[PDB]
């Protein structure tokens, strides 16, 4: 996956992020909190925000659809996600990804790009 330098982590240290994580898991337990950021140098459009809440049963495939709309991409345009630095399967749900890969600050990080392979 791409070498990410998460703006969310640059701006907030672990303690501050974990405090937010605790608060989000407490107030919205029926939602999966995700931090979404673009791979460096990607030509894809930037997202207005990076903090999103998604249903636990939303699949990666349905997630791709929502993101494509937000960054004005067409179905035939290349779009790849990286979780835990690797590409997830489209049938996996957000709740499943969160259960297996949420960060210690209690957030699930997802990077997006138009490229599928990085050195």
């Amino acid at each position: 996956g791409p070498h990410m330098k998460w703006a969310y982590k640059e701006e907030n240290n672990f303690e501050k992020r974990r405090a937010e994580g605790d608060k989000i898991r407490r107030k919205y337990p029926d939602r999966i909190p995700v931090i979404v950021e673009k791979a460096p140098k990607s030509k894809l459009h930037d997202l207005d925000k990076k903090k999103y809440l998604v249903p636990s049963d939303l699949t990666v495939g349905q997630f791709y659809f929502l993101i494509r709309k937000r960054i004005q991409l067409r179905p035939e345009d290349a779009l790849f996600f990286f979780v835990n630095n690797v590409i997830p399967q489209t049938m996996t749900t957000m709740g499943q990804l969160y259960q297996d890969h949420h960060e210690e600050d209690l957030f699930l990080y997802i990077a997006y790009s138009d490229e599928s392979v990085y050195g």
Binding site: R31, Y52, V54
Partner: peptide
């Protein structure tokens, strides 16, 4: 935070 907002719903995706």
């Amino acid at each position: 935070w907002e719903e995706l």
